[PDB]
Amino acid sequence: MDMANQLLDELAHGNFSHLTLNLSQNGREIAILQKQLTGFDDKQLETFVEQHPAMPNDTRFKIMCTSFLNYARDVDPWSAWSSSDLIFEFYQCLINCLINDNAPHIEMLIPVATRETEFIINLAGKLDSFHLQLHTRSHQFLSHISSILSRLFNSIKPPRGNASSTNIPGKQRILLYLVNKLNNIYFRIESPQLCSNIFKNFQPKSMLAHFNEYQLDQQIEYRYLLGRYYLLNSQVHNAFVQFNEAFQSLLNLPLTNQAITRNGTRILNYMIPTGLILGKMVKWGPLRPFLSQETIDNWSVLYKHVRYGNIQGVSLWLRQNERHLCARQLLIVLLEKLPMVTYRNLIKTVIKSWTTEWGQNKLPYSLIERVLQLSIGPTFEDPGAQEITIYNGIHSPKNVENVLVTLINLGLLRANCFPQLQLCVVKKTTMIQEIVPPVNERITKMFPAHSHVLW
Amino acid sequence: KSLEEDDEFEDFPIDTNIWEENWDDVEVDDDFTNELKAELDRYKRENQ
Amino acid sequence: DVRPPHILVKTLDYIVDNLLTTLPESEGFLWDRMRSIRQDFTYQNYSGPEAVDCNERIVRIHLLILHIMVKSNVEFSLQQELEQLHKSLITLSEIYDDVRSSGGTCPNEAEFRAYALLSKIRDPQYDENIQRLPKHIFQDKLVQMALCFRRVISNSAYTERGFVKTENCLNFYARFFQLMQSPSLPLLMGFFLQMHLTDIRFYALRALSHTLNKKHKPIPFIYLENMLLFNNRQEIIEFCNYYSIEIINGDAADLKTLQHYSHKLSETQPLKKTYLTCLERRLQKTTYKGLING
């Protein structure tokens, strides 16, 4: 039996059971098709699609079918590179069949498009790893895929304000799926700022009235990627609400797979430092199933150093953890934003005994300079470390007034400064929270994040 | 190995208070806090 | 019509040799011609060693020009200089990426990753880019220095249209002026950092003013001059006059009268760029050509 004619019947009637680039699912049928299609030139295949009965009179659809016939005819299963032109060509045609909202067999083509999208992403990574041997630039294949998915994303239109049906068109069903796929691509090619267009146009294109109406897994991944983006722009609160809601939503999911536990671990890897910057420390109870004991010990060491005002402790912890923190884009933001919390707790413990217990309303700069001598420890000026480092070049016990001034400007210390008296006056009180308020409330009030529930 | 260590979420066929209320009130004597308190006592004593 | 790479090297050699000391009278000539060298590299799609060397030394010449034009009174506005310096740093960064992707190395990469970290000192993009580079680039003393400057310059109260404030920034102005006086600070890097003296001083006085009570006396000019490393009194007087900080007793600044919350006044032009006396003194002890050749 003519298997090309048969396949063209199936494709002409929206039966895409054999329309796939995955030879692990299509191998035998594609082999038969390859033996039967050998002989025919490109124009003969194009004619096979053009003159086929019941074939939709769509140029892009017929281009897709012809491209799949070229693939099946010329595919070399022994060489992923030699067959890559056919594979990527057919993928681009397939996505082209989705740009028109009223394209033929659009609803049947969408699942095919998602399937082939996962396949072509895997193959695109595989081929990008050999960019030197293939004479291609870095991430060229996957970036091409990102362009295709970007045009598909632009073709998705918002709902009509007075729509006649509640039909969720399949282009809307995969909207968040496409957003997370595209943003993941932008993260893997190491150009995550390209997510900005994708994040800006997501909600305007969505027909769903609430963000919680998408699949909760896609919600979790979206909050994960959005939080990582925010954190890439050093917006710690905006990232924090996304990581937090992501991990809560993950706690609601039934723990079916190990990959869900590892995804929760991926969320925590960012939620713990982001929270710590905002003065929040986790309770390890609900985090036992997602974190090893050694990770908990590490973050607990950092927790002690920040909690009791040990700047040298914090810088030492960042120095020992430098390599994996840079891998997750975490070193710079912690190096910059953990110090003010650590200082806050340092002068918190100082003002506690000095003011609430010993009844001294004044904080001389010399006292805070000795305290900073204990907390900071060595600096670039000090001997034994004659080369400057991010861990010894920033913090110096000489800059008492600067630390106090930043503490007061961040709202972490309610006090007045006297530079010519060289002292810092707090309010005479026994309650320490009146002088040093809760840090998370102050930070979140000064930096109000966007709505944690998107919409 | 790369699927488990990479930051990108893994694909899975799909089918609470976790933060400290306040860590300022729950104070625990720390080693560093002990040396800091001792420094506060020595400074309080040299400056009489 | 276009120079091949080796005569672009010959031309930049000619400039480093014969035009650097012609000084602020030849700033336009120099900037235009260097831009022409880089453009000749782009005409031939050439990112080879000659393009790296030329863009590197051209970046250094831009850094020297930044200090020379400001030490004198000649130009005041360094917009084009900073624009072409930034574009050259972007070119160098892209070439470094392509060389790393090809398995090669560039010996001066770390220096110009630091300069790149100082081009847009408040853009988190360059922290993002610096964190994914190799460890020998990241842990290089020059990159470490630039990172320290980016940390001490960060300010949660930095105000400018289109700039999102970030949490828990340091605003370590005192540490900034401590590092600017360090003899270990590379001179050209210092020249690059002198572009932010006015901003850092403004936000220092703002942050300090928020800590003073209402009836606090004006802050003497001596304290603010040692704290902010002003070259002389005329500079701090012109600084207070620019930002409408009332000068009492002719030597003191009444910080509560500072009504501005942004370094950039809405209607008037920015205060002219300034320099540090220590860096000029260091420049007079070393040659232009020496600095440009590394």
Author numbering:
A (entry chain B): 1 to 455
B (entry chain C): 27 to 41, 57 to 89
C (entry chain A): 254 to 547
Task: Give sentences from the paper.
The TREX-2 complex (Transcription-Export complex 2) is conserved across eukaryotes and integrates mRNA export into the gene expression pathway and, in yeast, also mediates the location of actively-expressed genes such as GAL1 to the nuclear envelope. The TREX-2 complex has been implicated in a spectrum of biological roles including preventing genome instability, transcription initiation, gene-gating, and mRNA export. We circumvented these difficulties by expressing the S. cerevisiae TREX-2 complex using a single Baculovirus harboring the cDNA coding sequences of one copy of Sac3, Thp1, Sem1, Cdc31, and Sus1. Complementary structural analysis of this material has demonstrated that in contrast to the previously characterized TREX-2 complex from C. thermophilum that the CID-subcomplex is likely not to have a defined spatial arrangement with respect to the M-subcomplex and that the TPR-like repeat region of the Sac3 chain extends further towards the N-terminus than had been previously thought.
Crystals with P212121 symmetry with a = 78.2 Å, b = 84.1 Å, c = 165.5 Å that diffracted to 4.9 Å resolution using synchrotron radiation were obtained of the TREX-2 complex. However, the volume of the asymmetric unit (1,087,701 Å3) would only have accommodated the entire complex if the solvent content was of the order of 12% and so it was likely that they instead contained a proteolytic fragment of the complex. Consistent with this hypothesis, limited proteolysis experiments showed that in the TREX-2 complex Sac3 was cleaved by both trypsin and chymotrypsin to yield a stable fragment at about ∼60 kDa. The TPR-like repeat helices and the winged helix domains of both Sac3 and Thp1 were clear, although in places the density corresponding to some of the loops was less clear. Unfortunately it was not possible to identify unequivocally the residues linking these helices and so, because the density due to the side chains in these cylinders was not sufficiently clear to enable individual residues to be assigned unequivocally and so they were modeled as polyAla. No other difference density was observed that could correspond to the CID domain of the complex (containing Sac3 residues 727–805, together with two Sus1 chains and a Cdc31 chain), consistent with the crystals containing only the N-terminal half of Sac3 (up to about residue 555) together with Thp1 and Sem1. Although the material used in crystallization trials contained Sac3 residues 1–805, it was likely that, as is commonly observed, the CID-subcomplex and possibly also residues at the Sac3 N-terminus had been removed during the 2 weeks needed for the crystals to grow. Consistent with the possibility, micro-seeding attempts using these crystals in crystallization trials using freshly-prepared complex were unsuccessful.
